Amino acid sequence: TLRIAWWGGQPRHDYTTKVIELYEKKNPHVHIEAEFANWDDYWKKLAPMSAAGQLPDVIQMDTAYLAQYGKKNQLEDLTPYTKDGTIDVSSIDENMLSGGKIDNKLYGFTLGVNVLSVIANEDLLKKAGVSINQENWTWEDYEKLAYDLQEKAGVYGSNGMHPPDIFFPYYLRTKGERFYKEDGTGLAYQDDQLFVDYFERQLRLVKAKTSDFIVSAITWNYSNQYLGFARLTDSPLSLYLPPEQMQEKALTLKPSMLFSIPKSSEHKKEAAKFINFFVNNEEANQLIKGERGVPVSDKVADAIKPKLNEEETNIVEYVETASKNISKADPPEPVGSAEVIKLLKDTSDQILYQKVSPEKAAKTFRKKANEILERN
Numbered sequence: 001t002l003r004i005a006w007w008g009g010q011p012r013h014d015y016t017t018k019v020i021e022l023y024e025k026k027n028p029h030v031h032i033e034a035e036f037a038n039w040d041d042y043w044k045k046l047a048p049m050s051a052a053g054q055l056p057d058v059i060q061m062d063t064a065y066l067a068q069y070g071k072k073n074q075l076e077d078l079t080p081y082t083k084d085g086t087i088d089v090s091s092i093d094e095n096m097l098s099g100g101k102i103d104n105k106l107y108g109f110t111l112g113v114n115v116l117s118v119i120a121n122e123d124l125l126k127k128a129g130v131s132i133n134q135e136n137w138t139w140e141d142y143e144k145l146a147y148d149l150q151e152k153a154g155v156y157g158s159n160g161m162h163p164p165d166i167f168f169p170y171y172l173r174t175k176g177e178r179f180y181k182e183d184g185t186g187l188a189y190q191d192d193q194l195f196v197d198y199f200e201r202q203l204r205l206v207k208a209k210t211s212d213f214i215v216s217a218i219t220w221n222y223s224n225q226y227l228g229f230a231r232l233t234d235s236p237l238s239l240y241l242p243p244e245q246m247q248e249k250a251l252t253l254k255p256s257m258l259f260s261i262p263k264s265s266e267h268k269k270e271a272a273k274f275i276n277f278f279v280n281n282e283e284a285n286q287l288i289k290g291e292r293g294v295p296v297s298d299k300v301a302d303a304i305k306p307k308l309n310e311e312e313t314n315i316v317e318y319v320e321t322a323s324k325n326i327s328k329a330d331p332p333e334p335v336g337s338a339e340v341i342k343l344l345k346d347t348s349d350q351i352l353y354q355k356v357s358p359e360k361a362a363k364t365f366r367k368k369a370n371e372i373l374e375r376n
Contacts, residue, residue: 001030001031001032001033002030002031002032002033002057002058002267002270002271002274003032003033003035003056003057003058004020004032004033004034004035004056004057004058004274005034005035005036005042005045005046005055005056005058005059005060006034006036006042006060006257007036007037007038007039007041007042007043007060008036008038008039009038011291012036012291012292013036015287015288015289015291016034016036016288017034018287019278019284019287019288020032020034022283022284022287023274023277023284027273030270030274032274035056042060043065046059050069050074050262053262053264054264055262055264055265056262057261057262057265057266057267057268057270057271058259058260058261058271058274058275059259059260059261059262060111060257060258060259061107061108061257061258061259061260062257062258063099063100063108063254063255063258063330063332063333064332064333064337064338065332066100066102066107066108066258066260066332066333067102067184067331067332067333067334067335067337068335069107069260069262070102070107070332071335073263074262074263074264075107075108075260075261075262075263076107076260076261076262076263076265076268077105077106077107078100078105078106078107078108078109078260078261078272078275079104079105079106081268081269081272081275081276082106086269086272086273086276087109087272087275087276087279088276088280091280091297091298091299091300092279092280092296092297092298093296093298095253095323095326095328095329096110096113096253096296097109097110097296098328098329098331099113099252099253099254099255099258099329099330099331099332100255100258100332101331101332102184102331102332107258107260107332108255108258108259108260108332109258109259109260109275109279110255110256110257110258110296111255111256111257111258111259111278111279111292111293111296112224112255112256112257112290112292112293112294112295112296113253113254113255113256113293113294113296113319113323114222114223114224114225114254114255114256114293114294114319115222115223115251115252115253115254115318115319115322115323115326116166116167116170116220116221116222116223116242116251116252116254117220117221117222117223117226117239117240117241117242117318117322118132118134118142118218118219118220118239118240118241118242118243119214119218119219119220119221119225119226119229119237119238119239119240120132120217120218120237120238120240121214121216121217121218121233121235121236121237122235122236122237122238123235123236124149124153124155124216124217124235125149125217127152127153127155128148128149128152128153128217129148129152130145130148130149130152132145132240134240134241135241135246136246137243137244138243138244139171139174139201139243139244141243142242142243143201143204143205145157145218146158146205146208146210146211146218147208147210149210149217149218150208150209150210151209153217155213155216155217156210156211156213156216156217156218157205157208157210157211157216157217157218158205158210158211158216158217158218158219158220159212159213159214159216159218159219159220160202160205160206160211160220161202161220162220163341163344163345163348164198164199164202164344164345164348165179165337165340165341165344165345167220168195168198168199168344169330170242170250171194171197171198172188172189172194172198173245173248173249173250173251173252173327174243174244174245174247174248174250175194175248176247176248177189177191177194178330179330180330180331180333180334180337180373181373182330182331183376184331184333184334184335184337184373184376185334185373185374185376186369186370186373186374187366187369187370187373192359192362192363192366193362195358195361195362195365195366196358196359196362199348199351199352199358199361199362200358202348202351202352203351203352203358206352214229214233214237215229215232215233220242222254222256223239223293223294223315223318223319224256224292224293224315226239226311226314226315226318227291227311227312227315230310230311230314231311238314239314239315239318241322245322245325246325248327249325249326249327250327251322251325251326251327252326252327252328252329252330253319253323253326253329254329254330255293255329256292256293257292257293259275259278261275279295279296279297279300280297280299280300281300282299282300282303282304285300285303285304286303286304286307288304289304289307289308289312290304290308290312290315290316294315294316294319294320301316301320334373334376335375335376336372336373336375337373339372340369340372340373343365343368343369343372344365344369347361347364347365
């Protein structure tokens, strides 16, 4: 047998089960045993197995945990299986895969990509008499919009860019900088005024009447999350490119999730054959239909687009457009990023809700973050 595991909701469980049944029909000698759970319970399951050396042969993995599990050669490098043909990448661009690489080894194979977006309620934009020119609106343009939306529609401008470990790095990209060094040993940006300018704008918005409720004309999220909001909201919603991405190509092709193979598996070829099937089989992807993010193969993408309805189509058309003006994905979050993230959240509300000056909070943050990461 081959063991396979993932997290998600019940719709995902249902079609993933159907994908596995299809695989077994086409591969009778391979039985698959599935385990699955919501996000929280899933890591609860996988964490003890990781160190006990008994993970499933195919592991659904998240970028924020890839570096941790890839410790001490615990994950199998997938790069050679892309080279011997086990995993076909002839229709998968490199730019879909780099969010799963650490030190030039592919510890996770990306199953789908997401792109940050400003998701807007069209009825509430109209009500306030405002609109978004997504191709080149600026951060100043966004702040105006949030103010205008409140005083002319009584609705929040936005949920707010939460959390800060996602949208401060986005801000940095809009200014041509980066949060993590690619090698994960420290923060890349060195100019504390980037930090100051980010959290001063957060101050202005949070202390304003203009500050989830999207079912708030505006919500900040990854593109995949639009499906939930668009199905929930009777108003029409649209994905817009976020402010000031054009100049430095601030958006990236973020792995929604990845498949990995643990080095302890005794079924690596069969595991990799399943991953190849998952990302390249047209029939399987008529069942997945983009729910795990935009498919990485342009052949699979072409194959499912006719079947997608309005909301799913909006996502694919958003990602396809954004993807022509992107920068290189971040590597998986480095070990100790959990501490950095907690430090950033704690520093955020010392700024927003205590009177901690952003200039003081800035150097102080950068200080301790670099000491966390310095351990590599």
